[PDB]
Amino acid sequence: NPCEKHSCIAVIDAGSTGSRLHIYSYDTDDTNTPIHIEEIWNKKIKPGFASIQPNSVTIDAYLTMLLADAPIHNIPVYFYATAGMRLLPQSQQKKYYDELDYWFRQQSQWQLVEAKTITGNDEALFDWLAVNYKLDTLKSVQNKSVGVMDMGGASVQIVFPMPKNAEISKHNQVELNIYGQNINLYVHSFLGLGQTEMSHQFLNSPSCFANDYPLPDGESGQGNAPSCKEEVTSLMNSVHKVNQQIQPLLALNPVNEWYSIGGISNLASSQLFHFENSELTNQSLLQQGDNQICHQQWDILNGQYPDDEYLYQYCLLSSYYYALMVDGYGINPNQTIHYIPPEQNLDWTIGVVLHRAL
Amino acid sequence: NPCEKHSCIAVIDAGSTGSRLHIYSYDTDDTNTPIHIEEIWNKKIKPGFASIQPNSVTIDAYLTMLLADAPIHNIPVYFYATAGMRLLPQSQQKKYYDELDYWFRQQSQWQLVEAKTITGNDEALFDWLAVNYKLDTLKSVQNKSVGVMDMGGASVQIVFPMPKNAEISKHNQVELNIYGQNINLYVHSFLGLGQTEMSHQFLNSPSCFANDYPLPDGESGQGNAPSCKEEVTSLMNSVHKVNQQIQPLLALNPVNEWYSIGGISNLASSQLFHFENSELTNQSLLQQGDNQICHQQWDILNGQYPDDEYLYQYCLLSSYYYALMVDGYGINPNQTIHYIPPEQNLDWTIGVVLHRAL
Ligand SMILES: [Mg+2]
Ligand SMILES: [Mg+2]
Ligand code: NA
């Protein structure tokens, strides 16, 4: 019974591919900042909140599925949506939040505090705080710079320490003081470069799929990860200018340790890829995708690995993470990238627990 | 009931943003080819079939909404999905068709003949047949080349006469004999270049939205249609290589008359754009988007035109159409593009009526 003995709050991550409810217990320090944060309940549902029809009945069914069986009810709730809602204009988002408001009113258990769409810059800030909280690097001044990448379905975030730079948009910088230390971060979010959204530009690229994979417009896969990666790079850099925006800031503000969350954790953890110590390199990721998926015969590979719904996309995703990290951000292909094990349930929502007290 | 005296079939265009049921009555000529095709019923619903969750209740609700009030039944039904379903792997699509098949087997007003996702090349063939059926150019050999463009939510098609060519993929060429004439067409569909998918790459481009439009990541619009157009061109050409694929073939097989269907018809017929004779030029489209939407103050313009859900996108759409047609396909900016009025309910489904028999 942790909430009779500690502060508890519920935070919902309403992401593009699904929603995750977390209930956290915590204590606070002499400034009322959260410490000893523990997840006491987790429930994840699909699909994305923004993908459902915005009406009375659909929203009731969704929230009921997300929330009903939660072992404790009478606590404060934060519902924060990310890139799936950001694909919609505010006028269309309002329908969702109007219905969501009404639902929390028909019940007297949950105490809805806020429900809104957060910007990609806020999501990146919470990404950094959540990871660094878990690493225990917040309470003392660090010798080393820790960067975080979050690989989502409709957006990707990157976030790292950088002193205030009045040449760069205020939207891409954040200054916080936490646990008595002053931290300055660069934040950026690329909407359209998440997994789902970017995949929709390459479904008819034979280099991006296993041999003989049936592409939608009737051609056959003929995988080749270096080729697929160059196609993805054109979207990263010719369209979004990822390189031009990010590389000069990392040159001048190098990151010593990189951590990633989001889909890359699942792929790295899957039966198809082999990585030690919950870390990878981009070079090993591209070579493994090239040999274990791109250059395999699809029907054979599909039969060997029956229980993985993302299997058909692994040539593409391997290629895409390499294009993003190496050709986009400029990270060296042999640089270690730590990824958080998916079983740990780490998303940015611990960031909300902390930042609201700051 | 016309179907007691004429052949009737139902064809459903299951597109990315909605499904449209059409019931056609027709007679046949001496070769059993349809003539005198008349739409006797139309019903359109949203959202797209691929956007719903696939289970018994949801598909029943969707199919009931689409079909249940048709004045005529006891007829064959063809359900053909397009790019919305093409975004999904066959394993996910299969769930939708298994539930759809069951729904039809559980009733007796409709005789399902086929329910399947068609390729964008099939969709392009049907786009050309539907338009030329309505122009009455199919019964006699033409001394004018007619090209057809279909602007969808997830793909765009282009299709035009081109003699059979051993160097072009067979998948991009179609030969058919109709009404005693032999017609060879080049077909192409670009998955990811439809309006909805494209627009997801540019939601944070200030050049693509009216002044001060709130972009999702917190920057402000600062519209400029030529600048937006150049951004969209990088998707067209640096990613999809539209120019390299299409321009050489139009150079060798010039089109005399261009017809467009899909979203452009709605935009051009809206209260914000002014065109006569159901035709436009790319030069005028880009000018009108630039001056009438891009360079306006968002809140002022939104207050002036409350009744149009697409208004916020019109700076981006005018620029995207120009990027697609001018920079992608090579069409001269002063060349007339005819658009079928939206009231006419012309989509490619008339092609299905004709094509079966050939
Ligand atoms: Mg996420
Ligand atoms: Mg369509
Ligand atoms: Na997309």
Side-chain angles (χ1 to χ4, degrees):
Chain A
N1 254 339
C3 307
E4 334 263 73
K5 286 146 208 159
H6 306 281
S7 295
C8 289
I9 66 150
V11 184
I12 299 166
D13 169 5
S16 70
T17 62
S19 299
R20 304 98 195 187
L21 158 73
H22 302 264
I23 297 176
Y24 293 106
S25 58
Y26 59 94
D27 286 326
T28 70
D29 73 9
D30 289 21
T31 76
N32 212 25
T33 307
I35 57 171
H36 304 153
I37 299 171
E38 309 285 2
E39 186 182 67
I40 70 175
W41 182 248
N42 174 278
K43 178 94 176 259
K44 302 165 106 224
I45 66 169
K46 301 170 95 186
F49 183 66
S51 304
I52 73 183
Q53 300 177 237
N55 80 62
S56 185
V57 186
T58 318
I59 312 225
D60 161 72
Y62 196 83
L63 298 173
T64 297
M65 199 186 294
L66 183 64
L67 301 181
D69 56 356
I72 209 46
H73 256 71
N74 203 282
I75 51 132
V77 182
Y78 272 78
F79 177 104
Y80 278 179
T82 51
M85 284 292 275
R86 304 202 287 263
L87 299 174
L88 303 179
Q90 284 167 355
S91 65
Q92 167 102 337
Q93 297 194 33
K94 174 191 175 178
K95 305 178 185 225
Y96 290 85
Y97 293 113
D98 279 357
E99 293 297 341
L100 184 159
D101 288 352
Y102 173 86
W103 186 90
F104 283 93
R105 287 187 181 90
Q106 301 324 283
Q107 60 82 60
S108 74
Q109 315 259 321
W110 308 103
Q111 293 269 84
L112 178 65
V113 171
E114 186 159 61
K116 57 180 299 212
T117 300
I118 63 170
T119 61
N121 296 318
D122 285 351
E123 185 179 5
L125 169 57
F126 295 146
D127 279 321
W128 195 87
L129 280 171
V131 173
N132 282 271
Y133 176 87
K134 279 324 284 178
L135 297 170
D136 201 11
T137 49
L138 302 172
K139 70 193 207 305
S140 61
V141 161
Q142 295 302 297
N143 183 351
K144 57 209 218 338
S145 156
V146 172
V148 178
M149 284 177 291
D150 177 332
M151 308 297 188
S155 68
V156 300
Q157 289 71 250
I158 181 173
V159 46
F160 50 86
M162 183 184 78
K164 339 165 125 303
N165 174 356
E167 300 271 324
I168 290 173
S169 173
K170 70 190 147 171
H171 292 120
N172 293 117
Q173 305 176 76
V174 58
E175 184 172 351
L176 46 102
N177 303 268
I178 185 173
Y179 297 141
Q181 80 158 310
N182 177 260
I183 296 173
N184 287 275
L185 302 170
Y186 179 78
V187 293
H188 201 123
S189 177
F190 295 93
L191 184 61
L193 289 192
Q195 176 169 325
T196 302
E197 297 302 310
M198 76 86 186
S199 75
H200 294 178
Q201 296 307 320
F202 305 103
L203 297 181
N204 284 307
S205 296
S207 297
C208 290
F209 293 87
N211 291 332
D212 300 325
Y213 178 81
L215 305 177
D217 287 322
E219 298 298 338
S220 292
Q222 205 188 10
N224 184 55
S227 288
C228 179
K229 186 264 309 188
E230 289 299 343
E231 298 185 46
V232 183
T233 290
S234 288
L235 182 66
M236 295 296 168
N237 289 340
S238 296
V239 181
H240 292 265
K241 311 299 175 190
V242 170
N243 57 348
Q244 285 190 23
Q245 294 183 83
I246 299 298
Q247 183 276 336
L249 300 181
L250 287 172
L252 289 165
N253 305 274
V255 167
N256 299 127
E257 297 284 345
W258 283 103
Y259 283 77
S260 61
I261 54 178
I264 190 173
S265 283
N266 305 92
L267 172 153
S269 292
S270 70
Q271 291 189 147
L272 272 294
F273 290 87
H274 305 262
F275 290 111
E276 296 177 44
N277 304 128
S278 300
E279 62 192 30
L280 60 89
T281 64
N282 273 279
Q283 210 45 74
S284 183
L285 177 63
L286 190 73
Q287 193 65 206
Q288 287 188 51
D290 201 24
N291 299 310
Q292 300 300 159
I293 322 276
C294 296
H295 288 282
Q296 302 282 331
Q297 305 307 117
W298 169 244
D299 288 334
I300 291 182
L301 189 70
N302 186 52
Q304 286 180 306
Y305 296 93
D307 194 20
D308 190 336
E309 264 165 1
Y310 281 85
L311 178 65
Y312 75 104
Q313 260 195 311
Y314 284 162
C315 177
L316 172 66
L317 293 175
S318 285
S319 298
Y320 156 69
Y321 293 134
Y322 187 111
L324 178 59
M325 293 184 267
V326 174
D327 290 345
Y329 303 156
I331 295 173
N332 180 278
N334 299 288
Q335 167 70 35
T336 300
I337 311 294
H338 301 271
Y339 57 86
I340 298 296
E343 60 268 43
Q344 282 171 36
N345 286 322
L346 190 67
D347 49 39
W348 51 262
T349 48
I350 289 220
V352 178
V353 179
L354 289 162
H355 180 80
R356 64 189 298 255
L358 290 194
Chain B
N1 192 1
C3 306
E4 297 198 59
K5 282 227 171 183
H6 306 289
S7 300
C8 291
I9 70 173
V11 187
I12 296 164
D13 164 2
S16 77
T17 64
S19 294
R20 304 96 195 192
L21 165 71
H22 298 263
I23 300 168
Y24 295 107
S25 64
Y26 54 96
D27 297 312
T28 69
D29 67 14
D30 273 31
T31 66
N32 204 32
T33 305
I35 62 172
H36 310 146
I37 301 172
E38 294 288 358
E39 178 186 79
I40 65 171
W41 182 246
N42 173 272
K43 183 146 180 202
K44 304 151 95 187
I45 72 178
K46 295 199 210 84
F49 181 62
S51 292
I52 76 194
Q53 292 323 96
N55 56 64
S56 79
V57 171
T58 63
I59 286 224
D60 165 71
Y62 192 85
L63 301 166
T64 300
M65 272 215 106
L66 184 61
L67 294 166
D69 62 357
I72 277 138
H73 55 262
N74 286 347
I75 57 168
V77 178
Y78 292 81
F79 180 104
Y80 284 172
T82 57
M85 290 286 274
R86 290 186 209 120
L87 301 177
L88 304 184
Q90 190 277 143
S91 54
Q92 193 69 1
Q93 296 188 41
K94 178 185 187 278
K95 298 148 175 197
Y96 285 89
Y97 295 113
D98 280 345
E99 295 283 355
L100 175 150
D101 287 352
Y102 176 79
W103 181 89
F104 279 91
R105 288 195 297 271
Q106 285 294 104
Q107 59 79 60
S108 279
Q109 310 264 350
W110 303 104
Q111 283 82 103
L112 184 65
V113 185
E114 273 223 287
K116 67 182 191 202
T117 300
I118 63 172
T119 68
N121 297 315
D122 295 324
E123 187 182 2
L125 168 61
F126 298 146
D127 283 320
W128 192 91
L129 285 174
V131 174
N132 283 267
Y133 178 77
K134 299 303 290 172
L135 299 175
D136 195 24
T137 48
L138 291 186
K139 273 169 268 139
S140 45
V141 305
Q142 302 301 296
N143 69 4
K144 286 200 227 307
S145 171
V146 173
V148 170
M149 284 180 288
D150 172 340
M151 315 293 193
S155 65
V156 301
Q157 287 72 249
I158 181 176
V159 44
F160 52 83
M162 179 193 82
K164 186 183 261 203
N165 179 340
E167 304 236 0
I168 297 283
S169 172
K170 71 166 209 172
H171 291 292
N172 298 107
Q173 305 179 71
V174 190
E175 186 187 323
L176 61 167
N177 295 279
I178 192 174
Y179 299 135
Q181 82 159 303
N182 183 263
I183 299 168
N184 291 274
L185 299 175
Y186 174 83
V187 294
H188 202 123
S189 179
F190 297 96
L191 188 55
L193 294 184
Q195 175 175 323
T196 299
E197 302 299 314
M198 175 282 305
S199 66
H200 299 170
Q201 303 301 322
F202 299 105
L203 297 186
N204 288 308
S205 292
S207 294
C208 294
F209 297 84
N211 293 333
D212 299 321
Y213 177 80
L215 309 168
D217 281 326
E219 304 291 352
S220 298
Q222 187 190 337
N224 185 263
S227 298
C228 182
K229 191 260 319 190
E230 300 281 12
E231 290 187 54
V232 176
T233 299
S234 49
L235 183 67
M236 296 293 170
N237 293 340
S238 315
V239 182
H240 288 266
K241 313 301 192 299
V242 173
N243 57 343
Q244 291 185 29
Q245 292 186 78
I246 298 297
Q247 302 187 23
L249 300 175
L250 293 173
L252 283 156
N253 297 287
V255 163
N256 305 115
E257 295 288 345
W258 278 109
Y259 289 78
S260 62
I261 60 184
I264 188 165
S265 294
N266 308 89
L267 173 160
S269 310
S270 74
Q271 290 186 332
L272 281 291
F273 288 84
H274 301 256
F275 292 109
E276 292 290 277
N277 305 304
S278 294
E279 61 188 27
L280 55 78
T281 60
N282 276 279
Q283 175 174 283
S284 183
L285 178 54
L286 191 72
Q287 294 170 315
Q288 297 190 42
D290 200 15
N291 292 301
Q292 297 158 199
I293 315 293
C294 305
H295 280 289
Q296 302 280 336
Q297 311 297 127
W298 173 248
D299 69 328
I300 298 178
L301 186 64
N302 183 41
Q304 286 177 313
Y305 295 94
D307 194 12
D308 190 339
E309 297 189 321
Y310 283 89
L311 175 68
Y312 83 100
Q313 268 208 293
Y314 283 152
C315 176
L316 173 64
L317 293 179
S318 60
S319 298
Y320 150 76
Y321 299 130
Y322 185 108
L324 173 62
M325 284 183 278
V326 179
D327 292 343
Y329 308 154
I331 295 161
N332 189 287
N334 295 137
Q335 163 73 32
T336 297
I337 314 289
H338 299 273
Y339 56 87
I340 300 294
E343 312 97 282
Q344 289 185 14
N345 289 327
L346 188 47
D347 46 35
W348 49 259
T349 52
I350 278 174
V352 177
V353 182
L354 289 165
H355 177 91
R356 305 172 311 125
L358 318 175

